[PDB]
Each structure stands twice: as structure tokens, then as C-alpha cells.
């Protein structure tokens, strides 16, 4: 119980569900969840993590880094705890980019995401968060919020010519 929480891998039914909202903030259980997620994400050099990825079906995501080894060309993204999120695209403009996932180890695929979003949610103390994001920041937020509705990035790919093993695509 004191060991780092394991990341569930694609195929597990818990990655395919609708997460429930957090109803009570600033609780010992929620602080422990956030702590567990950061420890799990940092240990795996993740860019983000969603609670369903450690088997917790709650609307909690974390993301952010300065320099990240799995995505070495990505700019810094502010470290964030985002609970009960809503995403609103500012326009319908999209961009294709390469995504991975700690629940899909070893692979990358090209996924289109909105270029410009606003997002809203709360931190673990219940304080509102309201932000605008573009580019990779916007991409990570969309990827993580997808986990909360049971979506993994291969479900967003239409052209699987742009999908394969990281070591082959990025040697």
C-alpha cells in the first residue's frame, strides 16, 4: 500500500469508463490521490496522468513539466491539478501531432487536437481554474480529459499508417 500505484495498461476495462465528479475538496483522501498520481507520473516520466489510469474512476487529472524526456521537443507546461474539468474549443482549428500514453507503453500515433482551448476546473482545494491553452499544453489537457470519458488515443486515430512503435518512428 506504500508502494507506487501501478498504471493500468490498454485492455483493462477501467480505462473505458465515464469518471464521476469529485464532490468534496480538501479531504485527506483527495490529497492522497493527488500525491499518488504525482508519484506515479513522475516515476514514469509522464507528461500527464488521469485518475482512471491508476484504477480510480474520478474526474482528476494532473499534467505539466519543464523538460520531459518522452516528449523532448515540447515546451514547458505548467504543473496543474485539474478536477471536474470542462474544455471549450475557442475555434474549430485543429493540428495533427504525435501522442503517446503511459497506458499504451512503447507506441506513438498521430492525433488531431484542437489548437486553441479554454478549460475550467478546480484544484484539490476547490479553487477555480480558468485557463486558455494552445499547442502542446492544449493537447495534453485534451488527452487527459479523454481518459475521463473512457477514450484512449488509438480511438482518435483514423489513419493507422501514422501509428507504430516509438523506437521505430523515433530512433
* Interface with a second copy, residue 10, by CB under 8 A: yes
* Interface with Fe ion, residue 117, by CB under 5 A: no
- Pick from 75, 90, 93, 85: which is nearest to 143 by CA? 85
Mark 80-119 with x for binding to a second copy (rule: CB under 8 A) and - for no binding.
--------------------------x-x-----------
Nearer to Fe ion, 83 or 101 (CB): 101
Nearer to a second copy, 12 or 26 (CB): 12
Could you tell me whether strands 48-50 and 107-114 are parallel, antiparallel, or unpaired per DSSP bridges? unpaired
> Do 152 and 112 form a contact (C-beta atoms < 8 A)?
no
Q: Which of 4, 9, 26, 42 binds a second copy (CB under 8 A)?
A: 9
- 144 in active site: yes
Nearer to a second copy, 25 or 163 (CB): 163
Interacting residues of 166 by C-beta distance below 8 A, sequence separation 6+:
100, 106, 107, 108
User: Shortest approach of Fe ion to residue 53 CB, angstroms?
Assistant: 6
Active site residues: 144
Amino acid at each position: 500500500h506504500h508502494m507506487i500505484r501501478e498504471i493500468l495498461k490498454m485492455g483493462d476495462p477501467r480505462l473505458l469508463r465515464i469518471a464521476d465528479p469529485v464532490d468534496h475538496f480538501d479531504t485527506p483522501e483527495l490529497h492522497e490521490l493527488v500525491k499518488d498520481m504525482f508519484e506515479t507520473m513522475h516515476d514514469a516520466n509522464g507528461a500527464g496522468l488521469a485518475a482512471p489510469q491508476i484504477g480510480v474512476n474520478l474526474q482528476v487529472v494532473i499534467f505539466g513539466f519543464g523538460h520531459n524526456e518522452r516528449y523532448p521537443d515540447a515546451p514547458p507546461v505548467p504543473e496543474t491539478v485539474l478536477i471536474n474539468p470542462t474544455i471549450t474549443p475557442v475555434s474549430q482549428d485543429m493540428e495533427e501531432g504525435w501522442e503517446g500514453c503511459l497506458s499504451v507503453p512503447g507506441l506513438r500515433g498521430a492525433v488531431s487536437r484542437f489548437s486553441m482551448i479554454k478549460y475550467h476546473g478546480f484544484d484539490q482545494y476547490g479553487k477555480p481554474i480558468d485557463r486558455v491553452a494552445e499547442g502542446f499544453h492544449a493537447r495534453v489537457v485534451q488527452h487527459e480529459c479523454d481518459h475521463l470519458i473512457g477514450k484512449l488515443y488509438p480511438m482518435r486515430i483514423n489513419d493507422f499508417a501514422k501509428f507504430g512503435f516509438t523506437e521505430v518512428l523515433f530512433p
